[PDB]
Design a protein around this ligand. Structure first.
Ligand SMILES: OC[C@H]1O[C@@H](O[C@H]2[C@H](O)[C@@H](O)[C@H](O[C@H]3[C@H](O)[C@@H](O)[C@H](O[C@H]4[C@H](O)[C@@H](O)[C@H](O)O[C@@H]4CO)O[C@@H]3CO)O[C@@H]2CO)[C@H](O)[C@@H](O)[C@@H]1O
Ligand SMILES: OC[C@H]1O[C@@H](O[C@H]2[C@H](O)[C@@H](O)[C@H](O[C@H]3[C@H](O)[C@@H](O)[C@H](O[C@H]4[C@H](O)[C@@H](O)[C@H](O)O[C@@H]4CO)O[C@@H]3CO)O[C@@H]2CO)[C@H](O)[C@@H](O)[C@@H]1O
Ligand SMILES: [Zn+2]
Length: 472
């Protein structure tokens, strides 16, 4: 069967199914409704930065069409919606003055979601630092971000927390560190060779450290001031792609484990165990900031659940661990990526070159977290694949590869859950084709097609797959 035996009966009772977007990627009204610019606004408006010089000024215009989009998600039988609040839509300068029109939008969205029986899962941050804070403070390079983010979080808890019970602080801080401060391909475009300045060997670690400290501070505020009355939860969203040893050799197995530790351990070891992974301490040394005992105790246990974005997998080949001059976070791992074993590719690629379709990577990741980290509560906060640009409407709608993707990845997730993994929910990236960062509108991740000329929504076959699989 096209469902392949999947239904709500195949998952735990009360398991949460939803779709995911982010503010800059779907809202539009980027310079309207009182919103101040984010670092992504400035970045996207610079010629050459984004495919086709496109930007999120209009995006899917969810700002105006949110009731249509909520009706759609309900008609597809989803229980929940993961979306983000744009910081600069609330505080145009990141601090100080509140933009009441911005607040009203999120009130209206949250209220409509609840009216339709869709549970809001709200990210406070999704790559969209207020430009004003970047210029004034130096963004995530500055430890003061913990205070700034906490004040912002405090406002959101006070204003929406009587209705919102499921929060996330950050989205994929690893990607911010890697692309914004190691490679310098995403804002603020910092790296060793970069025009804006930077240092690929030190800055990614400073940035990650500040995300963890900011997360911990925001959660401490929630717990001490708001939790008693509101009785909600706050997590964090981390990307984790699977790494599989190329062979059963000691060095290949060691390499796969190093990669896991530098990828997910970087954040999970602090959040669960109150310290960075031993191998990162060993290899990165004095370039890795040290938590004080107090900070480590604040960070440890500071996530009520772990959001995991899971997409893909790769083979890892090992080598002799060497004394090296430090160059970058990426080079610190001392591993070699390989995308074939025994002459066969790990899987076919979706539109994005990094996204290899490998359903067993979902099992790999979920099982690994269960076994290593004491089976913490996990929510799959993003999973999906993209079609390329320039197809016809009907070609977008017949997304048979995506249907196969969801069936296979969810079957592998089910396998992990059945083996005892504490997974509480699953969110498909994305509800809609949207602004895909550097790819602009050339990458289509949605289960619902968006005509970017007319802004019309058209459910794809995969959307109807979800509707059928999720009927109550
Ligand atoms: O309907 C609007 C819209 O739908 C789009 O998507 C279609 C798919 O294209 C089509 O393949 C899919 O057909 C499903 C059907 O909905 C299921 O009910 C059926 O399930 C069977 C199953 O195959 C058996 O093995 C199992 O034991 O029993 C059930 C009995 O129902 O499986 C088929 C797939 O083979 O339906 C989607 C939704 O309608 C269309 O693309 C678009 O043109 C339509 O406008
Ligand atoms: O993208 C869809 C959706 O998902 C969420 O985030 C995505 C990012 O958008 C995407 O940029 C990021 O891509 C990673 C990829 O996961 C890694 O496998 C890849 O690894 C590199 C490695 O860094 C290099 O050193 C090596 O040489 O090559 C490998 C293979 O290319 O690095 C890329 C970075 O370009 O993956 C995220 C999830 O994994 C977001 O939540 C959402 O906003 C996005 O729209
Ligand atoms: Zn509009």
């Amino acid at each position: 069967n096209w469902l392949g035996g999947l239904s709500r009966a195949a998952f735990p009772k009360r398991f949460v199914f939803g779709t995911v977007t982010s503010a800059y990627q779907v809202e539009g009204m980027a310079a309207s409704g009182g919103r101040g610019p984010s670092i992504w606004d400035a970045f996207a408006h610079t010629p050459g930065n984004v495919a086709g010089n496109q930007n999120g000024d209009v995006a899917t215009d969810q700002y105006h069409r949110y009731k249509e989009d909520v009706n759609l998600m309900k008609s597809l039988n989803f229980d929940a919606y993961r979306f983000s609040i744009s910081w600069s839509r609330i505080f145009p300068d990141g601090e100080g003055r509140v933009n009441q029109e911005g607040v009203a939008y999120y009130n209206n969205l949250i209220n409509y979601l609840l009216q339709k029986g869709i549970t809001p899962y709200v990210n406070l941050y999704h790559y969209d630092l207020p430009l004003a804070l970047e210029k004034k403070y130096g963004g995530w390079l500055n430890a003061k971000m913990a205070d700034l983010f906490t004040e912002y979080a405090d406002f959101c808890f006070k204003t929406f927390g009587n209705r919102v019970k499921h929060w996330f602080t950050f989205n994929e801080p690893r990607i911010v560190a890697l692309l914004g401060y190691d490679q310098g391909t995403n804002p603020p475009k910092r790296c060793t060779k970069c025009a804006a300045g930077g240092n690929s060997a030190t800055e990614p670690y400073i940035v990650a450290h500040n995300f963890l400290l900011s997360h911990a501070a925001a959660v401490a505020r929630y717990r001490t001031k708001y939790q008693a009355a509101q009785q909600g939860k706050v997590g964090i969203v981390l990307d984790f792609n699977w790494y599989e040893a190329l062979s059963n050799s000691t060095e290949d197995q060691a390499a796969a484990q190093r990669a896991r530790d530098f990828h997910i351990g970087w954040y999970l070891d602090p959040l669960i165990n109150g310290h960075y992974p031993q191998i990162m301490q060993d290899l990165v040394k004095d370039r890795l900031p040290k938590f004080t005992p107090e900070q480590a105790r604040l960070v440890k246990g500071s996530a009520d659940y772990i959001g995991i974005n899971q997409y893909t997998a790769s083979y890892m080949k090992g080598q002799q661990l060497m004394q090296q001059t430090p160059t970058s976070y990426a080079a610190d791992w001392q591993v070699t990526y390989v995308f074939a074993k025994n002459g066969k590719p790990i899987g076919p690629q979706a539109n994005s070159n990094w996204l290899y379709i490998v359903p067993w990577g979902m099992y790999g990741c979920v099982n690994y977290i269960k076994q290593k980290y004491g089976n913490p509560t996990v929510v799959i906060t993003g999973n999906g694949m993209d079609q390329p640009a320039n197809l016809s409407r009907d070609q977008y709608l017949r997304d048979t590869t995506r249907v196969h993707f969801y069936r296979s990845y969810l079957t592998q997730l089910k396998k992990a859950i059945d083996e005892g993994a504490n997974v509480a929910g699953y969110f498909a990236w994305s509800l809609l084709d949207n602004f895909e960062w550097l790819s602009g509108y050339t990458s289509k991740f949605g289960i619902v097609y968006v005509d970017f000329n007319t802004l019309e929504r058209h459910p794809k076959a995969s959307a109807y797959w979800f509707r059928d699989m999720l009927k109550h």
